């Protein structure tokens, strides 16, 4: 439940 | 100046007429000419 | 007559120089110190022998029997940054969502609130400008945001580059393309329900080019409830329609990838709830939209020219209405002049094909953190970028009244629009020519 | 009345002029010789018969029952380089570490020492002003550093020019990119324990854009201990994090290809040893940290607009205070004027899309030898680069006073801040037109 | 106090007729197009409908 | 018989 807000798949 | 109101729950104002000398003279020297002087003392315009 | 004399050495006659300069090994060293190029002390007298102080006492004396005056002109050089703190343009506050909770059994509780974000110092550039900008909202939800709720989707103010409506079909009331057409036009913001931004505090309302039509009433606040008429429209479900080929159509794509709620006001409406400046302006109500109080401007990086004052409080005399004082935020001036700041504008077609290209050339997707979502998505780039460029300014001011006795130490002093030295001076001298007017 | 006589021609009257210049091919040959474009004699002649010299006997004398004057107007070009040892550009001090030992059986000893690294005079723009520096600090590494112990993993000093925290998330404690988000901000330096740079005699500090809020104060020293707040933060552990999808992220990134340590502070910080000068000042404390006593600036390649001083000796009357002399680095003043130097300003998004494909078009990875630490990596080239640029400078003085009597030859002389002749000069010459003032 | 500025005056002596030079800076920021210029708008005559 | 007015094939 943590959201890095940063697209890793791309 | 040091002015001591009763409390007002509303925003007011304190007038002050600073009472002066308001005048003119007026010179008419020529057909359809008017020159004026004003003159205000204290407090010149 | 016309004399010009100096302690010890041959009368001169007609004219001559005298200059003001802030270089001298000598006087740096004792004098100034403390100063620095914009309020400094500096020896006239260019004498080699005498210690400077013992400088000062002598003096330079125009003959008493004529008024003299001298021309003055000035070599004035900076290099104040873009975006600093000094010009007020790295703050403005903005009121974001804090938190999304769950309440009281069936009330879906949104807290929003005022705050100010800062920039780092420099960045020049406009886009780039504004992405910092961008990035610094994010920089808060980072810190508030998400720990307290409050999705990517529901995302308060952003500042785009766009015109979310090029798409657009009368009919549909959709963007057909499904995608919000991916060019330039001009800065605007946009805001979510319930937020929006204030410069009231803040220069950089002028690099996003959006001004009030009536500057002097203090209070630049531009509410989401302001943007009235002019709520970017939404995006054709492609896939569906072509797929279905009734037709789908009504079909307002929902979301996106990584599934993201474009917030549509209700299961109807082709509408969005994000409201869009540039929208308002030329699309809303013309008389009471926003079109009404605000102007679509030309960007400029520079934020706003700026003009800065000289003083010689102890060479000329004070200019009609000044009056003497030792105040260094009231001396009389003797010359204005535009603060040293240009836009320089260059042309990048590799913008947007270089955003596209830019990301990989950046290891991060730092700017773009949201790839999919066609309107958190990182403006793009305008062909056409502007940066402020600092330059030398050969300026030239009138000839001025002096005194006839001119002391051994003069001060300098350039101030600006609010009085006060300006840290970004790193050059400035002038050159001073004494010549008669009259006589007594 | 106001006559102007010369030799035995037609008395002339009102005014004329006279000609300063260089190029003459007769004196070229006899007078100057080991002189240069800076401090030359010239006839002032320009009568075809006549040995110069013989001419040198000659004088134009302008009407003695008058106070003359004439208007003085330049033209003066140069092609300084950017980067020169005249200018003080070529050098500057930094303290690195020389060596790193095992000692006394469980110290360890580290050594460091002050030193000051020169560069190979010419090489313009910016970014590669700054390459060429740290160049040098890794050169010497070559000649001292690693055959005494020191690693790679520990290269005191090192400019950059990025912003090593835009990745960063305020909870994690990390740029979670795993990489330094890739663009060019602002020049800044880095520093590693113990270490640090030194400027108090450069002005390669005014091309980093990096000034002292108090000027005067001689002593410009960037010390490690000052960049407190704002060390650069340390890499997430991209690869463990995804694998491992508790959550690994805790895991800061300790090495990299090629294993070279990223000095972290201790086995549980999130922080690395290396302190960024462009960190402390924005994200450091504003009260103490280094924001309080630097400025962060344009930078400017030019490294600062700097002025040069005329004198005609033989011709002009000594302004004002100056008193007149023989010792050509005293000579009395009668122009000033700021040396032809400007900065160009391009655009090229090819950079970082060009580093990316300049390492491949320069045959080598001389700059970037550490293509892997995000550290020491090659610092991004920033899109709008700068170049000193040498242009003539059509200046123009003002009306000064001249003697009744002008010489054969007269001594021209361009000097600088410092008062001596600029090697840099390539043409000067300047035309005098004499009037009358008054009468004796 | 402004206004009260208003009032005091700058008396370029009576004798004699001034003049006096006057320089000034503008800066403006209008848009290539805008509707304040007449760039906005602009005529033209199109077909409306095609009929059997 | 809608035209939508875009080439959605390229």
Chains 1, 6 share one sequence.
Request: hydrophobic share 35%; net charge negative.
């Amino acid at each position: 439940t943590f959201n890095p807000v940063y697209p890793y798949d791309t | 100046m040091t002015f001591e109101v009763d409390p007002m729950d509303e925003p007011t104002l304190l007038y002050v007429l600073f009472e002066v000398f308001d005048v003119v003279r007026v010179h008419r020297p020529h057909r359809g000419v008017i020159e004026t002087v004003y003159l205000r003392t204290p407090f010149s315009a | 007559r016309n004399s010009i004399r100096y302690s010890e050495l041959a009368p001169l006659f007609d004219t001559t120089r005298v200059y003001l300069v802030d270089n001298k090994s000598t006087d740096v060293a004792s004098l100034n110190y403390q100063n620095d190029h914009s309020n400094f002390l500096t020896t006239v007298i260019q004498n080699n022998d005498y210690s400077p102080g013992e400088a000062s006492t002598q003096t330079i004396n125009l003959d008493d029997r004529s008024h003299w005056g001298g021309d003055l002109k000035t070599i004035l050089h900076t290099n104040m940054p873009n975006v600093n703190e000094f010009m007020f343009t790295n703050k403005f506050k903005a009121r974001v969502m804090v938190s999304r909770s769950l309440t009281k059994d069936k009330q879906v509780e949104l807290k929003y609130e005022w705050v100010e974000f800062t920039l780092p110092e420099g960045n020049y550039s406009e886009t780039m400008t504004i992405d910092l900008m961008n990035n610094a909202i994010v920089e808060h939800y980072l810190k508030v945001g998400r720990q307290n709720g409050v999705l990517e989707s529901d995302i308060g103010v952003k500042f785009d580059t766009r015109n979310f409506r090029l798409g657009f079909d009368p009919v549909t009331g959709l963007v057909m393309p499904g995608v919000y057409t991916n060019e330039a036009f001009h800065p605007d913001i946009i805001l979510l329900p319930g937020c929006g931004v204030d410069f009231t505090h803040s220069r950089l309302s002028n690099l996003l080019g959006i001004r009030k039509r009536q500057p002097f009433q203090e209070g630049f606040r531009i509410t989401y409830d302001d943007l009235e008429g002019g709520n970017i429209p939404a995006l054709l479900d492609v896939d569906a329609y072509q797929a279905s080929l009734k037709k789908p159509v009504i079909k307002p794509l929902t979301e996106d990838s990584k599934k993201r709620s474009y917030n549509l006001i209700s299961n109807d409406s082709t509408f969005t709830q994000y409201r869009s400046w540039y929208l308002a302006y030329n699309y809303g109500d013309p008389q009471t939209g926003i079109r009404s109080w605000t102007l679509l401007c030309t960007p400029d990086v520079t934020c706003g020219s700026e003009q800065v004052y000289w003083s010689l409080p102890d060479m000329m005399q004070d200019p009609v209405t000044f009056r003497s004082t030792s105040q260094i935020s009231n001396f009389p001036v003797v010359g204005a002049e535009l603060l040293p700041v240009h836009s320089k504008s260059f042309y990048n077609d590799q913008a947007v094909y270089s955003q596209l290209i830019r990301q990989f050339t950046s290891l991060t997707h730092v700017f773009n953190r949201f790839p999919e979502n066609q309107i958190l998505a990182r403006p793009p780039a305008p062909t056409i970028t502007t940066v402020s460029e600092n330059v030398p300014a050969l300026t030239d001011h009138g000839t001025l009244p002096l005194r006839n006795s001119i002391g051994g130490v003069q001060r300098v002093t350039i101030t600006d629009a609010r009085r006060r030295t300006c840290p970004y001076v790193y050059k400035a001298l002038g050159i001073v020519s004494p010549r008669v007017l009259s006589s007594r």
